[PDB]
Structure 1
Amino acid sequence: DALASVDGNNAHVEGSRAEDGEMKPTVIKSNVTQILRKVVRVSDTANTTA
């Protein structure tokens, strides 16, 4: 979210009949995940050598 625009020039008569100011809503920001995979296919004979 954010506040109003650059402020300044705020002078209102005692009676102004407010004109439905323009407040703004929030901003939605989203992201997505990512998969990281590392595979190892090693034999059994090699898993016994020195």
Structure 2
Amino acid sequence: DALASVDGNNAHVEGSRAEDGEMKPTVIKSNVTQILRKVVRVSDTANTTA
């Protein structure tokens, strides 16, 4: 979210209405994941020796 271009002129009289003010909603930003894998093989016959 952000602000609506703030200004330095906020000087109101002593007692008045609201003028409905002003607001700004949020913004959504999405991302997708990624899948990366590594594979390997080994023969179990390499254990008898040292």
TM-score class, shorter-chain normalisation, is: 0.5 to 0.7
Counterpart-to-counterpart distance in 1, 2:45 and 2:6: 72
Q: How many residues align?
A: 50
Listed as ranges, the gaps of 5+ residues in structure 2 are: none
Give the 3-state SS of the residue equivalent to 1:45 in structure 2: helix
Point out the more displaced range, 31-40 or 21-30.
31-40
TM-score, with length taken from structure 1: 0.53
If each structure's helix is expressed as a fraction of its own residues, which one has the higher value? 2
Gaps of 5+ in 1: none
Distance 1:4 1:16 in 2: 22
After TM superposition, the score normalised by the length of structure 2 is 0.53
Q: CA deviation at 1:29?
A: 1.2
RMSD: 3.1
